[PDB]
């Protein structure tokens, strides 16, 4: 054997074991979700409070690309930051040449092709992150989830990390119960609940909630962080549902 | 075992062993403590010597008038990363006439360490850094790990027996955070914190290394007879 | 050269003469200065024929590759690609291009790109050597939300005067109509437009 | 400071009945100053003859370059290069230096060993081929040579008659040019013998 | 990374030998024997073609003996493809020298430069060495008639008579036995063929399985002529010496 | 050089 | 003087055979008609070396392209490759070409300028005698020309150049490219400038020229 | 990133074997039988068109390729490796000869250029050898008709007649009995079809057999008239009909 | 055994990495089919959306390379999109350089040559995909050309790819034995799509809803994919006969 | 730099080179040796642009001396002259060409013949019985055309050379402060101290 020792090597199955090993690093990471809504998207993430010494609200994990795209990821934090840094260069060069801000499907492929490129050679390591991202463009709202292999699809709801199966189960219920659609302000409250429900799979350390959102009506099509009254309103909603 | 030959290889459980071995180099390193209030941020570093005839390895490096770090692990790697921070702090000043944010300083170190963990031939940095600074959003303390993970904290400690000082600061959190407009008392709290990581050895005049930055205080380092006050 | 693009109710109309000259000799008297960069994005070429042909070919290539990945580009996007080439290579280019396209959302749009490589979005644009003689006429006669027949008459009368006074302009008046209906080519011969 | 007319010199090539003639002057000067009266401008690679006029340093360089290329040709092909093929090689080599050219006026002459057909060709400094049935002229007295050749020349001349025509064409042309003359050389080329004659001409 | 699959072609053994050079020589030892014999009035190059097929075109064939210039030739032993790379380089190097100095290249200078290229592949680049051994037969106005041999190591030495390829041990003993210094070309021709005839792995030595060449001053007055023997010319010289 | 219809 | 004329079932290009260095006629009967491909022919004016070099290079790349794609080459491919090459060199390659031919798409006629600008037309003329030629084309050209009419118009347009333009002279070369047929290259189609018999033979009595030395040259090995 | 394979993947084994060349020759052995026969007035190259599927159009896949108007090529072994060699072989004929001498290279020199490309794949960094053996038939004015074999090593040999691939051992023995120095081109085509029938198992007709000749000049295939010296290509690919005509009188 | 890790020859003259790239082809468990009409070329592929959270509009293995050329992929989506983007760039560049739309067979050869390089060069792995190119070429007419990880490519009368490729292949073979022609003798592309779906149903033995199928159609001067409602309309016509 | 002469006679080559080095309105030196020994039986005199002359001469000297060590053999005057010409032929199409004119006087030990080569800065080589560079030629060539014979001795050559220097000293505008004379023969290179 030894097929798993080198990246870009096909096993007799036709599998790249190094990419499957990168997925194990993602599964080990904290829970992050994405909820597609009526006229935008909502991103939420679990931040494990390792110690009292961590400054609250001052270890931001969700990252903005351009002014209209939000990105959250689970697994190796640095890898995620590297991918967003690339995303920003791709989005900048698109706007530079074509004037218009990069569409989400266009942006999704730019990351997809970049992550896929890191499965072609043994001289590079696959990305140790599953990235949930999206925003609002001319064609409306888009939510995507990108995996170490370079595989991405459009999603109604997306979840990754240690509590992905708990989150996925809760996301599936929203899609079933809201066929006509979910509102931006509702999706923020739901996002909070699902993180709190997904925290049951990581319940040794207590955690800190972080939510962001793009909405054509609520945020004027731009990416903003949910803070202050709207954040505490979402936390209180989540606290009431677990009890 | 078979997956620790280079940094480009993942283990079957999704671990980077070369990055973990680089993390191990920090644990062997001499203890250093970081803690801050709202007005000032303090670095305390236990310096290490080869023998009684040798000097004590300098742990603290100045990056700008408003920023600097303490090191634990490979000192040459700290020199490379500190030199990079100096250039980034300097680039911000010359181009934008702007003091580099301590948060951006962290983001830049994170991205520099990361590139060394994803490419063949290179190796991870073998040092951990505690960056303190005072910018437009007050006092800051960062913990840099060569995995790429940078964390903003009230207080922390890295190196051998750092768990002793880290437990003390976790107890003292509510006290030392409110030491505002009092440099000497914030240092005393830092010196008492690092004292919880000592075994057989005690803090002497050429052993202890303290650095402070704050509201009306440029980043300055205290060594020799200047730290005799705090023993 | 005499060229112009006019926006009206149903979309936009592109107009140009058909005269390419070397000094005071007419190299081509039946030139097509209206060129397709996309199905419903066309451009008007003035300056060095060689330079404008080179730019147009590259833009067409860029918008074809854009369409393959991200679907139909906007008229603004096309004008941005033109600008990028004209601005970044301003030292080595002599190209005055009017970009005119029909979206379903944005309707008829006209962007003019002078020598510098600056972009100007306008309700109508005139360019080329013969444009100087019809600034007075076009300003006085242009109205927004004209009909197809009114816009064709406006362009025909305008380029008729431009051709009459400018030695560098003449031949036939070519026109390209961009609307939701599709793409229509029009031609007008000296015997008609000269005696307007 | 005109590279083509610093050193001076002329080459002329003619065709006859189953033969070719190539001739050149022997002058190498530095403008007004005559320096050498032994500077031959005709070289040969097997049975193919090349005459080069223009800047003397480039005449020497190109001779050495074509000797280089014809030697490698023969080793790989296992046969001598033919005039038609060599003409293409010269053209290729000159145009390779399109925007930094050799200031030369080369002239190929020879008989194709297979077909036995007489062949002559001329080039500009950037390698444009000028093929001719009758004659090729080159150098600082090209105008003079054109006038002499166009009047004197007639087709299907015997080697002995052809010698007299090409010789009188060169001599009288060289005497009306300040930068040409100082002795001349004539090559009479038959299928499988080549005669080389040095002409007596006025030494001014 | 790629380190895993690197053979490390340019390293020393514990004994201080170059693995790849030693294995390249082992390769050459299976190649058809090539003999060079230097006489007072010329040089002989004889080479045995590798197990010939009856349907091989023999007259328009070149496997062993190659022409570098008008004065120098080489007999090949090893990979023919590798030899042709080095021959084209040697041919260019000879013309570069002629172009520079307006004089035909001295034999040793050509041999040294070709040997220096082989040396390069054993010390740096991480590529396999050229699996080729040459016998250089040439003339210049300094040393006159010269035989050299180069091998994959890039080491070259001068000889009076030498063999490369298969059965060199047996071949070198037979040459050492019958060779003398006052020898003529016609005698050296006979020795070359007689040596191959005894050392050959074939049943009987025939015209179709041989390449033959001489470098004489047999041309008209103080000039060297290279003769690459035709099939019929080898058939005649083989009868004339009484081998067939 | 230079020849130039 | 070079021109191209379109007729019903194909295109015809013609050119004169005068090559000049300054005011001197270097070649009285040179070939300005180049074969890019078997059914794509090119006529070139400007720097002689540049027209020959650029037509051969694209002709080479067209042949490799034809073999690669398993298809007969197109005139637009030759046109695109020529104009992009000429444009890259900013007019320093002084090649003024009339590109014509037949391909699976149909019959085509284009002109290319040194700076890389291309034009489309039913009749075109390039070179020093283009104005003399274009005058004839403008006077006698009509829509729906036959093969024989187009050859007559094309050759008449070249003749106008030959007589009236000092840059042009000697003979008329023609190449007819008809759809569904092999392109026929008519080298020296007209020869209306034959040199009249000389008044006198200038054959010298043998021994007229004074000789200093004789020697046999060795061409053999 | 970047190609870190700057070292040879083909190296000498202790026994003196170049493993990758030996294994490349094994791949050629597995390949479908192709052959070449040289006549007095022409050359014939032939091979079986092994169809991957009956739905596949075997006309689109050309095993016999034109390199120059007077040179043709057929192979045994890995088809893809052959296809890119034909592309490189056609280009090198132009770049390294025709653009210098204004005429097509002679057979032996084009073979030499192809051999050089295949030799470099044996020694260059981070590449395997080509898994094909070529048979190159060609004509030129000074050498006349010639037939060459090119092996993965970069070694080439001139042949009167030979076969490569699956049933080469039996095919070569068959050609030894039938070949003489007085064979006319039509006699060589007849022997080629007889030799190929032995190796072919399934259908034997003009649709399953690919056969081309290097013979007389073809003015009809030139595509233009007016230049006397240009008389047309000597390379001609026999049609499916032309083969079936010769299979009746077999 | 490092001869099984990179693209070098095994003792028996095989490239195991190329052979393992072929097994990656069937990792998606999707069967594709391509057939030619008189005026058109139709390609159909199974559409499997297992996750309920997925946006089904974004789940596609059919790509619009150029205006005239369409491409369906059998293999993982990352390698599929890698191949798609390259083909689009190659088709765009071809048009710019040579002044006419890249033919289907020429693009197929170009992508096959790129695939061949990966089988010879060590640092590049083969793409675990089989690319089926379809168009109505202006010279050759309706065209199907398929590429594989080996760098092999050939024209097809019709073709099928995927796990149950052999069942579909013989189903099509038996039809062309009967019809005695190289194509589907049909005027409209609508009925050629109906043929394609019908023969896939017979071969696989499964029924299809509108969301179970994905259809691409190549006509003269444009290739386009069908919406769910375009396929639903097509499924109704089959059921009513 | 200005006057360099060369005369090939029966059994030797004689090189005469002016001693004056002038910059502006000042003769900085009146004892300058404008020559380098390339090998025991090859001498090269040089004249032209300041700095370029010595830099070029020493560069050639180093290359010929390197060859002599490598092969343990002296290159023929013909071989050296061909090498020098190629270096100047390269130079003239460089970014900044060597503006240096050289005479190469050598004795070929294999042929037992003296050889004089005149090479200008363009890389224009000629073998001559007598040669000169710069304005010197305009006087000396016509003088030597008259007085020179091919079978002359070294002593006759020196008297012929004195006749040239006298003519130059009479009619040349600039004071070149006399010449250093050197003889190249079978016994190598030696300098005439009293001229
Ligand atoms: Cl135009
Ligand atoms: Cl390709
Ligand atoms: Mg006018
Ligand atoms: Mg005179
Ligand atoms: Mg005079
Ligand atoms: Mg590979």
From Swiss-Prot, chain A:
Cellular compartments annotated: Cytoplasm; Nucleus
Signal peptide: none
Broad class of where this protein is predominantly found: cytoplasm
Molecular function, one GO term: mRNA binding
Keywords: Acetylation, Cytoplasm, Nucleus, Proteasome
UniProt PTM comment: The alpha and beta forms are probably products of the same gene with different post-translational modifications.
GO BP of this protein: proteasomal ubiquitin-independent protein catabolic process; proteasome-mediated ubiquitin-dependent protein catabolic process
A GO-annotated cellular component: proteasome storage granule
Oligomer and partners: The 26S proteasome consists of a 20S proteasome core and two 19S regulatory subunits. The 20S proteasome core is composed of 28 subunits that are arranged in four stacked rings, resulting in a barrel-shaped structure. The two end rings are each formed by seven alpha subunits, and the two central rings are each formed by seven beta subunits. The catalytic chamber with the active sites is on the inside of the barrel.
Assigned protein family: Belongs to the peptidase T1A family.
Miscellaneous remark of the record: Present with 12000 molecules/cell in log phase SD medium.
Name under which the protein is recorded: Probable proteasome subunit alpha type-7
Species per Swiss-Prot/TrEMBL record: Saccharomyces cerevisiae (strain ATCC 204508 / S288c)
Organism ancestry: Eukaryota, Fungi, Dikarya, Ascomycota, Saccharomycotina
Portion of the parent chain present: 6 to 248 of 288
From Swiss-Prot, chain H:
A Pfam entry, by short name: Proteasome
Function: The proteasome degrades poly-ubiquitinated proteins in the cytoplasm and in the nucleus. It is essential for the regulated turnover of proteins and for the removal of misfolded proteins. The proteasome is a multicatalytic proteinase complex that is characterized by its ability to cleave peptides with Arg, Phe, Tyr, Leu, and Glu adjacent to the leaving group at neutral or slightly basic pH. It has an ATP-dependent proteolytic activity.
GO cellular component: nucleus; proteasome complex; proteasome core complex, alpha-subunit complex; proteasome storage granule
PROSITE patterns: PROTEASOME_ALPHA_1, PROTEASOME_ALPHA_2
Annotated compartments: Cytoplasm; Nucleus
Source domain of life: Eukaryota
SMART domains: Proteasome_A_N
Keywords attached to this entry: Cytoplasm, Isopeptide bond, Nucleus, Proteasome, Ubl conjugation
Cross-link Glycyl lysine isopeptide (Lys-Gly) (interchain with G-Cter in ubiquitin) placement: 108
Keyword Cytoplasm found: yes
More details: Present with 7060 molecules/cell in log phase SD medium.
Record family assignment: Belongs to the peptidase T1A family.
Name recorded for this polypeptide: Proteasome subunit alpha type-2
Keyword Ubl conjugation: yes
Annotated GO biological process: proteasomal ubiquitin-independent protein catabolic process; proteasome-mediated ubiquitin-dependent protein catabolic process
InterPro entries: Ntn_hydrolases_N (IPR029055), Proteasome_alpha (IPR050115), Proteasome_alpha-type (IPR023332), Proteasome_asu_N (IPR000426), Proteasome_sua/b (IPR001353)
Curated annotation (Swiss-Prot), chain I:
Localization annotation: Cytoplasm; Nucleus
GO BP: proteasomal ubiquitin-independent protein catabolic process; proteasome-mediated ubiquitin-dependent protein catabolic process
Gene Ontology cellular-component terms listed: mitochondrion; nucleus; proteasome complex; proteasome core complex, alpha-subunit complex
Transmembrane portions of the chain: none
Residues joined by cross-link Glycyl lysine isopeptide (Lys-Gly) (interchain with G-Cter in ubiquitin): 222
Main location: cytoplasm
Top-level taxon of the source organism: Eukaryota
Keywords, alphabetical: Acetylation, Cytoplasm, Isopeptide bond, Nucleus, Phosphoprotein, Proteasome, Ubl conjugation
Phosphoserine found at: 227
Function comment: The proteasome degrades poly-ubiquitinated proteins in the cytoplasm and in the nucleus. It is essential for the regulated turnover of proteins and for the removal of misfolded proteins. The proteasome is a multicatalytic proteinase complex that is characterized by its ability to cleave peptides with Arg, Phe, Tyr, Leu, and Glu adjacent to the leaving group at neutral or slightly basic pH. It has an ATP-dependent proteolytic activity.
Binding partners and assembly: The 26S proteasome consists of a 20S proteasome core and two 19S regulatory subunits. The 20S proteasome core is composed of 28 subunits that are arranged in four stacked rings, resulting in a barrel-shaped structure. The two end rings are each formed by seven alpha subunits, and the two central rings are each formed by seven beta subunits. The catalytic chamber with the active sites is on the inside of the barrel. Interacts with CIC1.
From Swiss-Prot, chain J:
Localization: Cytoplasm; Nucleus
Name of the protein: Proteasome subunit beta type-4
Modified residues (Phosphoserine): 76
Other noteworthy facts: Present with 21800 molecules/cell in log phase SD medium.
CC terms in the record's Gene Ontology section: cytosol; endoplasmic reticulum membrane; nucleus; proteasome complex; proteasome core complex, beta-subunit complex
Main location: cytoplasm
InterPro entries recorded: Ntn_hydrolases_N (IPR029055), Proteasome_beta2 (IPR035206), Proteasome_bsu_CS (IPR016050), Proteasome_sua/b (IPR001353), Proteasome_suB-type (IPR023333)
Key words of the record: Acetylation, Cytoplasm, Nucleus, Phosphoprotein, Proteasome
GO molecular function: endopeptidase activator activity
Assembly behavior: The 26S proteasome consists of a 20S proteasome core and two 19S regulatory subunits. The 20S proteasome core is composed of 28 subunits that are arranged in four stacked rings, resulting in a barrel-shaped structure. The two end rings are each formed by seven alpha subunits, and the two central rings are each formed by seven beta subunits. The catalytic chamber with the active sites is on the inside of the barrel.
Gene coding for it: PRE1
N-acetylmethionine sites (modified residues): 1
Protein family per UniProt: Belongs to the peptidase T1B family.
Any one Gene Ontology BP term: proteasomal ubiquitin-independent protein catabolic process
CDD domains reported for this sequence: proteasome_beta_type_2
